[PDB]
């Protein structure tokens, strides 16, 4: 759909790989409601990506 | 007229294709079933030989989109890449 | 100016507790409050003082958003169980919007519209409706009565929505 | 050129939302408005296949 | 009053001005709701002033 199929795919590569599963257990990392919240409110109505 | 028409009638395609994904399914009908009219519709589908922006946008998702149902005779999308190149007083 | 889709998503649960409720008890909102009102320095400090009364018209902005049912509840079950969530709303009134979100000794027309819309909802729900109406502004004279007060600045707006 | 369509206010349907949510408690068989100009519009249109 | 002032005085001394009052009275100009939406729906939440 959207920008380049290379950006795309590492996006999709990385998310796959094993290490990264492992990585987001253990953690403060695993994105606290509150986090994500941060986040979505950042973002503006303006320029959407969706 | 059909110039004009065609215009305001793609304008409409894709302003629909924009609140949704996947080709207003009236202009897919028309394609193979108003095939003259395709080709008078079709040519306001690429009659952007004009700058093309670094963002992919509406016109250009719309045009992928036939492009991938195999739509789009090569021949006219050629012609669209080629011309989008672009004393008294 | 990022967030006009999270105050929608905030619409959808407020309502939904309204709904399972009404399956006379207060609302966690005005708790939330009370809370982030005290957590404030109580320090005078100009700083301070601005810092709390831009906290107060977020949380007058917000209640504007979600529905008049927080305030008043809805169906007011028997004049016995009366005047629950009312009193947390009047305590807030004078504790804090009477300092920052108000002018002349008067509140503003949109709180005013959004509580008397609000209360209408509840009594005409209820059962001697007229009746009902006047015991919670008779109530309004002792426990908040710069609603009265707002009202009476208010009123070329709201009468006509009412009738 | 055209080229797609402006989204405008995600406001005002915010504001429309208050004040349906207010007549849905001030009801609660009686019809709505709403589906009465659905009809309208659909009526004004043209019925043609263009 | 024409001055290449400051605009923000132009339009309040604009506003002032009882002629300009006496305008709004004739009444394809005291602006309709709908007047108002058709404006207000043009507007972007990309820009804005407010």
Chains 1, 5 share one sequence.
């Not at chain 1, 199929?5 to 987001?24: I, K």
């Not at chain 4, 068989?29 to 043609?48: D, K, P």
């Amino acid at each position: 759909h959207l920008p380049s199929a290379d950006w795309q795919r590492a996006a999709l590569s990385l998310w796959t790989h094993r290490t990264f599963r492992e990585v987001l257990k253990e953690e403060d990392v695993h994105l606290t409601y509150q986090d994500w919240l941060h986040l979505e409110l950042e973002i503006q109505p303006e320029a959407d990506a969706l | 007229e059909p110039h004009s028409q065609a215009l305001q009638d793609v304008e409409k395609a894709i302003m629909v294709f924009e609140h949704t994904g996947n080709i207003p399914v009236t202009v897919m009908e028309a394609s193979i079933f108003r095939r003259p009219y395709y080709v008078s519709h079709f040519l306001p589908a690429l009659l952007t030989p004009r700058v093309l922006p670094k963002v992919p946008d509406s016109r250009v998702a719309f045009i992928e989109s036939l492009k991938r149902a195999d739509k789009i005779p090569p021949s006219l999308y050629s012609t669209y890449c080629q011309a989008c190149s672009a004393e008294p007083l | 100016t990022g967030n006009e889709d999270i105050i929608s998503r905030l619409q959808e649960m407020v309502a939904d507790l309204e709904l399972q409720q009404d399956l006379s008890q207060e609302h966690f909102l005005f708790e939330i409050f009370r809370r982030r009102l005290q957590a404030l320095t109580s320090g005078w400090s100009v700083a301070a003082s601005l810092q709390r009364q831009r906290e107060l018209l977020m949380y007058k902005r917000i209640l504007l958003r979600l529905p008049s049912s927080v305030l008043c509840g809805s169906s007011f079950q028997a004049e016995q169980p009366i005047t629950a969530r009312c009193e947390q709303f009047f305590h807030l009134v004078n504790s804090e919007m009477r300092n920052f979100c108000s002018h002349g000794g008067a509140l503003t027309q949109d709180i005013t519209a959004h509580f008397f819309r609000g209360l209408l909802n509840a009594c005409l729900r209820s059962r001697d409706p007229s009746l009902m109406v006047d015991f919670i502004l008779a109530k309004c004279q002792t426990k908040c009565p710069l609603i009265l007060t707002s009202a009476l600045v208010w009123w070329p707006s709201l009468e006509p929505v009412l009738l | 050129l055209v080229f797609g369509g402006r989204t405008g206010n995600e406001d005002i349907i915010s504001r429309l939302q208050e004040m349906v949510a207010d007549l849905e408690l001030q009801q609660d068989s009686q019809e709505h408005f709403l589906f009465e100009i659905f009809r309208r519009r659909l009526q004004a249109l043209t019925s043609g296949w263009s």
